[PDB]
Amino acid sequence: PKYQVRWKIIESYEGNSYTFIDPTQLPYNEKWEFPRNNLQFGKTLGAGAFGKVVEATAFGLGKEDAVLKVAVKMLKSTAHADEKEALMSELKIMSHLGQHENIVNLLGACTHGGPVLVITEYCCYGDLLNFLRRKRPPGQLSSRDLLHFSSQVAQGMAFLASKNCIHRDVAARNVLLTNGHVAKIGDFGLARDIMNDSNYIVKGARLPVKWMAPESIFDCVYTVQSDVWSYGILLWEIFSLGLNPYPGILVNSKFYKLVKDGYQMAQPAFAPKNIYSIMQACWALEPTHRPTFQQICSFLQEQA
Numbered sequence: 001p002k003y004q005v006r007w008k009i010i011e012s013y014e015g016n017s018y019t020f021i022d023p024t025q026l027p028y029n030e031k032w033e034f035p036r037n038n039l040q041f042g043k044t045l046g047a048g049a050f051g052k053v054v055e056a057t058a059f060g061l062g063k064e065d066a067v068l069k070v071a072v073k074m075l076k077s078t079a080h081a082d083e084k085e086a087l088m089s090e091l092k093i094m095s096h097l098g099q100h101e102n103i104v105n106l107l108g109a110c111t112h113g114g115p116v117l118v119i120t121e122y123c124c125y126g127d128l129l130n131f132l133r134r135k136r137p138p139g140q141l142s143s144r145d146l147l148h149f150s151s152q153v154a155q156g157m158a159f160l161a162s163k164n165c166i167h168r169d170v171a172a173r174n175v176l177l178t179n180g181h182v183a184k185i186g187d188f189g190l191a192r193d194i195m196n197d198s199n200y201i202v203k204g205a206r207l208p209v210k211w212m213a214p215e216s217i218f219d220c221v222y223t224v225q226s227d228v229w230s231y232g233i234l235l236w237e238i239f240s241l242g243l244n245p246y247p248g249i250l251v252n253s254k255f256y257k258l259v260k261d262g263y264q265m266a267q268p269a270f271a272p273k274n275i276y277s278i279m280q281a282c283w284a285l286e287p288t289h290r291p292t293f294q295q296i297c298s299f300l301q302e303q304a
């Protein structure tokens with residue numbers, strides 16, 4: 001029922017990254033501001049219980065006065081106070097993270113004279129899960145390309161981790177493909193029908209339990225290492241060409257016991273053995289035994 005910002009900046013004891021500030025507690029930085037009516041709406045890309053995302057044309061957006069297609073996030077006109085706060089919080093975090101080639105970047109915002117609108121990159125080929133499902137063989141794509149996708153998502157995640165940013169909803173539905181079929185990770189909950197998505201299970205909240213690390217499920221702890229677990233599930237999605245994780249198994253008491261016992265999905269049909277080894281490493285029960293995203297990146301490179 002509550003919206004529901006997944007991205008989170010955490011505190012940093014070790015690692016190469018140090019957290020000086022909590023961005024949601026300062027901005028909003030006005031350098032992002034964009035004239036409201038230099039936007040013309042188009043088709044609705046998606047919608048849910050809290051808002052929607054619409055394709056649009058932006059007239060003279062960046063420093064180069066150019067026109068381009070963009071995706072505009074926004075809340076229902078019925079949105080309550082807290083949820084507008086959550087939207088501003090997502091805005092502030094995206095602005096704090098900076099730009100990277102394998103995330104869905106912030107391009108601007110309209111915060112004055114009407115409802116808050118968040119302007120982010122338009123990715124022409126849509127989300128990764130759908131694209132996978134349309135490129136199945138009987139029962140276009142290629143093994144090189146799946147390795148490209150895996151690498152590009154790992155790069156985006158290495159970038160987030162370097163900012164001490166946790167995602168907490170890493171999954172194929174949250175990966176987009178843009179020109180050149182380059183993968184970009186983001187969070188598109190706003191555009192999704194969460195209330196009716198069986199992949200999100202009722203708790204406190206609505207949680208993607210099948211993508212979640214053991215320690216997130218039982219201890220409600222979230223670190224970059226827990227994102228690594230989820231990335232392994234994402235890998236399984238890619239190399240199964242878009243099968244639902246744990247096919248046929250419903251989330252209930254027996255599932256929770258399985259994962260806690262050390263159950264791991266079997267090797268996907270289209271996964272090379274060494275890629276499966278990445279998944280297995282990602283699913284180590286002890287969090288400090290999992291790889292980091294940069295170690296995944298270098299292995300995927302060595303394997304290419």
Ligand SMILES: N#Cc1c[nH]c(C(=O)Nc2ccc(C3CCNCC3)cc2C2=CCCCC2)n1
Binds near residue numbers: 071073120121123127
């Ligand atoms: N929130 C958000 C956000 C940020 N960018 C986008 C975006 O670019 N989305 C899409 C762009 C193009 C297409 C095209 C439009 C029709 N042609 C096929 C792909 C589909 C989408 C999707 C919207 C909702 C989530 C799944 C992907 N959504």
